[PDB]
Scaffold this active site. Structure first.
Site, PDB file in Angstrom:
ATOM      1  N   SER A 124       0.743  -1.275   0.000  1.00  0.00           N
ATOM      2  CA  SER A 124       0.000   0.000   0.000  1.00  0.00           C
ATOM      3  C   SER A 124       0.769   1.319   0.000  1.00  0.00           C
ATOM      4  O   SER A 124       0.148   2.391  -0.095  1.00  0.00           O
ATOM      5  CB  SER A 124      -1.022   0.019   1.114  1.00  0.00           C
ATOM      6  OG  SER A 124      -2.065  -0.898   0.804  1.00  0.00           O
ATOM      7  N   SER A 148      -5.873   3.179   4.107  1.00  0.00           N
ATOM      8  CA  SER A 148      -5.196   2.321   3.154  1.00  0.00           C
ATOM      9  C   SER A 148      -6.222   1.532   2.335  1.00  0.00           C
ATOM     10  O   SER A 148      -6.071   0.335   2.093  1.00  0.00           O
ATOM     11  CB  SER A 148      -4.208   1.397   3.889  1.00  0.00           C
ATOM     12  OG  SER A 148      -3.208   0.955   3.018  1.00  0.00           O
ATOM     13  N   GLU A 207      -5.111  -3.629  -6.785  1.00  0.00           N
ATOM     14  CA  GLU A 207      -5.431  -4.294  -5.518  1.00  0.00           C
ATOM     15  C   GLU A 207      -6.387  -5.470  -5.762  1.00  0.00           C
ATOM     16  O   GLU A 207      -7.341  -5.337  -6.541  1.00  0.00           O
ATOM     17  CB  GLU A 207      -6.090  -3.304  -4.554  1.00  0.00           C
ATOM     18  CG  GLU A 207      -5.168  -2.226  -4.025  1.00  0.00           C
ATOM     19  CD  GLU A 207      -4.227  -2.723  -2.946  1.00  0.00           C
ATOM     20  OE1 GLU A 207      -3.548  -1.865  -2.329  1.00  0.00           O
ATOM     21  OE2 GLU A 207      -4.165  -3.957  -2.696  1.00  0.00           O
ATOM     22  N   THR A 238       1.507   3.366   5.285  1.00  0.00           N
ATOM     23  CA  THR A 238       1.974   1.998   5.523  1.00  0.00           C
ATOM     24  C   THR A 238       1.759   1.100   4.301  1.00  0.00           C
ATOM     25  O   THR A 238       0.987   1.424   3.377  1.00  0.00           O
ATOM     26  CB  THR A 238       1.204   1.370   6.688  1.00  0.00           C
ATOM     27  OG1 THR A 238      -0.198   1.357   6.373  1.00  0.00           O
ATOM     28  CG2 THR A 238       1.456   2.163   7.998  1.00  0.00           C
ATOM     29  N   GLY A 239       2.420  -0.054   4.306  1.00  0.00           N
ATOM     30  CA  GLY A 239       2.130  -1.087   3.311  1.00  0.00           C
ATOM     31  C   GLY A 239       2.259  -2.440   3.993  1.00  0.00           C
ATOM     32  O   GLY A 239       3.182  -2.645   4.788  1.00  0.00           O
ATOM     33  N   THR A 240       1.329  -3.341   3.682  1.00  0.00           N
ATOM     34  CA  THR A 240       1.291  -4.672   4.285  1.00  0.00           C
ATOM     35  C   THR A 240       0.933  -5.713   3.203  1.00  0.00           C
ATOM     36  O   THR A 240       0.118  -5.451   2.312  1.00  0.00           O
ATOM     37  CB  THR A 240       0.276  -4.721   5.446  1.00  0.00           C
ATOM     38  OG1 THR A 240       0.568  -3.662   6.385  1.00  0.00           O
ATOM     39  CG2 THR A 240       0.352  -6.059   6.175  1.00  0.00           C
TER      40      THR A 240
END
Length: 265
Positions: free
Chosen positions: A42, A100, A140, A209-211
């Site tokens: 993200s 996100s 996504e 953030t990115g996950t």
């Protein structure tokens, strides 16, 4: 001694860690695997919003976008509650950054237009900011799910830090649009346990953030010291040794950020 401490973190969390903090007029760059590719996950949503802001008048933020339950692909904390009503471009930008929201991101990608449902256009935007390294190839949720080693949907800590620097501290956007991106990042809801956890309370932190799978956990931030001096901090991680189902480790990011904060103080 930072290389040794980051290496110790990697061993502790069975992880690969990437860190970049650009040089400033008074500080040296901090780098660790800074030119290795990591999945965006993200974190791409921050420059995605910038691309949308850049290519349209402010009045575009008030355009209502309609979508269906079937368009929801993808962790989407905001979009899930607005199928009946739709969401404006501005609301989509807000959601994409602060929650996100993946459906919000897919819709903003569609708004950019062109082949790959906007991914080519997004990648083109990064190219326009001097980033020749990063690439977005999927939307996504597939973009979080490429195998380790795959070049698809990757950036490097170095590349994304330089992009974020231009967007927030530089002149990539005009002041009014720059302020919108900054405000959304400032009010991010998803980053409390990452770079924010590594910086003392008297530092301001804005972030995205990115996950992902394979234990992927990223965070990109601009921070300001207690006397107002800004730094850009990119931290990226994965845990490929645990395979697809490896759990992301937020503490790894908080620990790396703590190391960084100590050097910048």
């Amino acid at each position: 001694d930072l290389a040794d401490r980051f290496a110790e973190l990697e061993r502790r969390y069975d992880a690969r860690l990437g860190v970049y903090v650009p040089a400033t007029g008074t500080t040296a760059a901090i780098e660790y695997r800074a030119d290795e590719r990591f999945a965006f996950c993200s974190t791409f949503k921050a420059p995605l919003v910038a691309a949308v802001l850049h290519q349209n008048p402010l009045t575009h933020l008030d355009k209502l976008i309609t979508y269906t339950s079937d368009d929801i692909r993808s962790i989407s904390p905001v979009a899930q509650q607005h199928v009946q009503t739709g969401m404006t471009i501005g609301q989509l930008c807000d959601a994409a950054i602060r929650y996100s929201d993946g459906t919000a991101a897919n819709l903003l990608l569609a708004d950019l237009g062109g082949p790959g449902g906007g991914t080519a256009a997004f990648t083109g935007y990064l190219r326009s900011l001097g980033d020749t390294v990063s690439r977005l190839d999927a939307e996504e949720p597939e973009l979080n799910r490429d195998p380790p080693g795959d070049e698809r949907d990757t950036t490097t800590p170095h590349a994304i830090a330089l992009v974020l620097q231009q967007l927030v501290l530089g002149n990539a956007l005009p002041p009014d649009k720059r302020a919108l991106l900054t405000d959304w990042m400032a009010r991010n809801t998803t980053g409390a346990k990452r770079i924010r956890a590594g910086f003392p309370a008297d530092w301001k932190v804005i972030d995205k953030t990115g996950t992902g799978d394979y234990g992927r956990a990223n965070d990109i931030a601009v921070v300001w010291s207690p006397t107002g001096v800004p730094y850009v901090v990119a931290v990226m991680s994965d845990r490929a040794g645990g395979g697809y189902d490896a759990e992301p480790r937020e503490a790894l990011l908080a620990e790396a950020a703590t190391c960084v904060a100590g050097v910048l103080a």
